Amino acid sequence: NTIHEFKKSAKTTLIKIDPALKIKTKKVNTADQCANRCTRNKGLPFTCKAFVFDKARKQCLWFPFNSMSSGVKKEFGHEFDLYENKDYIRNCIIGKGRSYKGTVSITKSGIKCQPWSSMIPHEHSFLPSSYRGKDLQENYCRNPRGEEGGPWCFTSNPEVRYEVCDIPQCSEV
Amino acid sequence: TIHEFKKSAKTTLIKIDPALKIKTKKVNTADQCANRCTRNKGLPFTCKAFVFDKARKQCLWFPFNSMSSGVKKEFGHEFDLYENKDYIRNCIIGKGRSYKGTVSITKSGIKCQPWSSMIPHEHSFLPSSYRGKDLQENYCRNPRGEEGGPWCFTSNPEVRYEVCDIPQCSEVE
Numbered sequence: 001n002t003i004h005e006f007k008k009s010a011k012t013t014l015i016k017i018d019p020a021l022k023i024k025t026k027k028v029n030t031a032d033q034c035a036n037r038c039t040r041n042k043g044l045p046f047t048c049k050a051f052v053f054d055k056a057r058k059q060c061l062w063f064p065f066n067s068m069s070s071g072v073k074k075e076f077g078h079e080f081d082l083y084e085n086k087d088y089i090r091n092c093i094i095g096k097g098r099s100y101k102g103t104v105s106i107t108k109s110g111i112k113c114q115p116w117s118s119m120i121p122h123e124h125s126f127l128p129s130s131y132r133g134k135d136l137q138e139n140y141c142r143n144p145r146g147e148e149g150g151p152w153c154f155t156s157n158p159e160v161r162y163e164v165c166d167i168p169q170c171s172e173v
Numbered sequence: 174t175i176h177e178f179k180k181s182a183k184t185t186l187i188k189i190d191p192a193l194k195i196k197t198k199k200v201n202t203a204d205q206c207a208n209r210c211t212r213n214k215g216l217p218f219t220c221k222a223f224v225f226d227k228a229r230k231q232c233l234w235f236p237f238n239s240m241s242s243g244v245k246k247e248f249g250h251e252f253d254l255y256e257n258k259d260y261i262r263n264c265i266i267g268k269g270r271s272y273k274g275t276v277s278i279t280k281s282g283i284k285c286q287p288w289s290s291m292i293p294h295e296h297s298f299l300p301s302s303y304r305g306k307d308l309q310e311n312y313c314r315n316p317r318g319e320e321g322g323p324w325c326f327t328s329n330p331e332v333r334y335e336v337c338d339i340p341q342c343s344e345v346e
């Protein structure tokens with residue numbers, strides 16, 4: 001059961017503008033079944049980078065792309081959950097990590113990040129709705145304003161309002 | 174939980190900068206170290222790797238891994254090193270000579286053949302012949318820095334070798 005290993009985006013599927021891109025689909029019972037097949041990459045004629053479970057039609061849709069790939073866009077739908085393979089979500093930072101979309105959620109000193117959508121312990125104005133494009137989801141380390149310190153988060157320790165996270169640069173010689 | 178880690182058998186790490194934090198604890202199994210590192214519970218840093226001492230049943234948790242500047246990868250028969258996949262670069266620089274991630278599927282979805290196996294395909298890309306290149310398991314690798322990036326011998330007898338689909342670090346914003 002590998003489903004917990006993916007980055008989940010609720011109420012979301014992906015559509016390919018480029019008709020060339022390939023998809024595979026199958027009627028299934030549960031989302032973990034899609035996860036298993038993606039992780040194993042069994043019986044797919046491509047590298048699985050993401051999948052969607054359609055809870056209304058009970059289908060898996062496996063993709064050789066994710067939400068950040070060229071030629072694909074997100075689509076809203078209550079019936080869909082998107083699961084993106086973390087092996088295809090860049091896990092290092094470019095520049096100050098404005099564009100970081102990885103799932104690290106602990107600060108440099110080991111403190112669990114507070115969720116962006118929560119005002120507890122720390123009341124703040126970094127609401128996801130104020131920062132579209134910046135992926136202020138769950139409690140992920142992010143740098144929505146492109147500040148010199150790199151990705152950071154509000155902290156679950158009431159005594160520490162915010163702290164930077166310790167995410168490595170992709171390339172710095 | 175232990176599967177979220179890349180395992181290097183018979184290996185440990187040693188710091189050269191004595192300001193790097195470490196935490197140790199006598200435990201029962203390596204699985205218990207993985208759990209504590211995943212939960213990041215009671216560690217005053219971001220856990221990026223751990224070593225299990227099988228002879229002492231001790232966990233050593235680290236805020237570094239083998240690619241961190243100033244740590245020494247060392248042989249030791251009683252040690253196994255486990256590195257958190259979130260901290261092993263999952264994109265390629267240049268042609269990907271330095272790629273050390275755990276992707277093991279080709280671009281057309283085929284499971285890689287182990288570098289140690291000669292079945293279905295016989296070859297001279299042995300670990301011993303390529304020290305430092307991490308030709309372990311069936312990981313996509315680029316030991317000679319060839320054009321298409323990391324690749325592998327394929328488990329399909331019809332396809333000797335094929336590149337994998339590891340993204341360039343420059344592919345996304």
Ligand SMILES: O=S(=O)(O)CCN1CCN(CCS(=O)(=O)O)CC1
Binds near residue numbers: 152164
């Ligand atoms: O806490 S407040 O809501 O008042 C202000 C939010 N805030 C401004 C100061 N920084 C430093 C950037 S970084 O060093 O963390 O990258 C991010 C956190």
